[PDB]
Amino acid sequence: HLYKTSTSSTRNGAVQVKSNPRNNLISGQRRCGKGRNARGIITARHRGGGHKRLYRKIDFRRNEKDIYGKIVTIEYDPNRNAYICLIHYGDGEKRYILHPRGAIIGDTIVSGTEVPIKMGNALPLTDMPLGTAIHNIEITLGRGGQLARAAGAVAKLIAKEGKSATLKLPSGEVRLISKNCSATVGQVGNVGVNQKRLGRAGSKRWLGKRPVVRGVVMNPVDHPHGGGEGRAPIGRKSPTTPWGYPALGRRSRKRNKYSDNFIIRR
Template sequence: MALKSYKPTSPARRGLILVDRSSLWKGKPVKALTEGKRKTGGRNNKGHVTSRGIAGGHKQRYRYIDFKRRKFDAPATVERLEYDPNRTAFIALITYEDGEQAYILAPQRLAVGDTVIAAEKCDVKPGNAMKLSQMPIGTIIHNIELKPGKGGQIARSAGTYAQLVGRDRGMVIVRLNSGEQRYVLGTCMGTVGAVSNPDNANQNFAKAGRTRWKGRRPLTRGVAKNPVDHPHGGGEGRTSGGRHPVTPWGKPTKGARTRKNKQTDRMIIRSRHAKKKR
């Protein structure tokens, strides 16, 4: 998909750059594969704001995506590519030979009429899913499981991918976009190819209103608040916020390490924070 820039016929159009979605399906999604979606406004069941910056936004329907790809040895044809308001990537509607339909994440270079299949071992072709242990070393993959049968969790956003770089002790070594290298069980599933819509990050929405349509409210800087409202608040004149930037609840931020998931440390071979070799 290419980017589309607009002539400055109004202030809202000046600088506007969007992804060209003219080749996507223009109708409604398959109703049986969708569900109504209620907005929370960032509030929990007590009405308290637990996620700041959420409000408004266009009404959406959730599309059920098949992240598991466990219907083995059943070829499916790509009916159409669709926009999904719930994610940055595009999705593909596939139809199996028995008539069953499903949505999957659309990889790059997947076109209408293509055939995809999920199996323990199959051709290395965009959209095909197989067990990681059966993939050739060097394969570009996405929608990677961390637990067999749980469904893909890694590399699902627009333009993302990982690379299978080795095998060891019944596991495979996967290099992620962040530079991290980690072990993943060979019995986990992965899908060949990189996720569609790589130009998503290059869009320029040109006005605050377009972000509000997405359901995101503006966030006030901590240094612009009072001391009662934020650790960076207060002070005479304009201040920088102090030497140690923190969240409103005092947790270090802007680069400070806060990760505490020690259970998976043994699976990480090379941290994403390790200095890259030149």
Template sequence: MALKHYNPTSPARRGLILVDRSGLHKGGPVKALTEGKRKTGGRNNKGHVTSRGIAGGHKQRYRIIDFKRRNWGVEGTVERIEYDPNRTAFIALIGYNGGSAAEGGEVAYIIAPQRLAVGDKVIADKKTDVKPGNAMELGQIPVGTIVHNVEMKPGKGGQLARSAGTYVQVVGRDKGMVMVRLNSGEQRYIHAGCMATIGAVSNPDNGNTNLAKAGRNRWLGKRPLTRGVAKNPVDHPHGGGEGRTSGGRHPVTPWGKPTKGARTRHNKSTDKMIIRSRHAKKKG
């Protein structure tokens, strides 16, 4: 979808760039496929803040998405493409067995890939046609194909490439495993029995938007965070100093743990599945 640029009729409109969502469904979601969503404000069950920068935001209902795509051999029709406040990608309402949401038929939400339109047919099976929206096992997908919503364990549901504009590329096969390349540059093995959906995720322009005012971030539930270098030494390791300082040589969190690129991954059982780390220096 295209981007919308606004005329500077006010300071809040100057520089505002949003995704044009005029082609999406205008009404609300299917009630049977939603559930209530409580806001935490970043607090845990004791009321302590465990995630800073979270509070407020518009009230939302969670849309139940079919990440597993295990309804094998049943063809579905795309009824509409919808906005989902819980994710950056758009979602598609699929009607199965000729049913629709209006008639109370079998319906489900999936992550909408690029180039999927209302009226298109989609199907999930062990092996099927390579076209956007179809889902099949990774071991049956041709090498070089772009996929998304990729499982990491058979039957668990898609975990990789679910955000707007993301995708995974199948680069090879080896003894019941499939080699894939992620957007980060990492290459890894995934079991050939894992499901993946053809195509890249919708709304690739999401990263090109400009909210233009702090209030628009507050609507999304994000609170402002004060930089550590602007605080006093009692409040942050970067604080204090005479005049303006950069905060020292090694950036740390308010609790002294290294941050901004410091490696935190240790003793992961899945490290053996990684062929090439995303941290490996690019050749050429």
């Protein structure tokens, strides 16, 4: 840790120390996915089970404009770890929005064109100096996708660029997307919240997904490779079904091809 509110670390005593939640909810939920990795005919792509899910919620695109706000209190949501608060616009529109950084006390929070740049709400990139700290960009002028993982959701820019295309995605290198888009302009979601360690699985891993490791475990049928006294013919192409883990490369197009540039591969 390097910032305040250090992550609690359960000292030794008995391998690990699970827990038992207990809270309340107030509307703002449909039912969320509750069928486990399936399809109705074939599970497809194994690894995925365990209960403890539900609770979906919404609010992403944000069509509201020049409307003040007031972040009431903070709140956490399953799956994605980066808070979501509950805010409270000047008028009284019940929403959530991705919890920026320095807030909780309400702060400003406001969307629309020509608004105070800091970490309010939606704000068209068309009106942005450099953009050293955005948040969640959108492929189009209406969606709210891309890096929605508030935590670590970073994507610098290139000061002022024409042709209506900039954005500097993290591990995704740099690409070109419409400029007529908007974002929360937060680019924050706490990094220490994910800095913590799982522990030793059991009551922390399975409670979210089935075993992630498979191993050779022999059996030429159960897996493209296997057999032998104990060792495994690794490297000799052993991916589940013609895959190819040694890079190779994918995603091939010609017309609607990738508009990303630079993209270094070391």
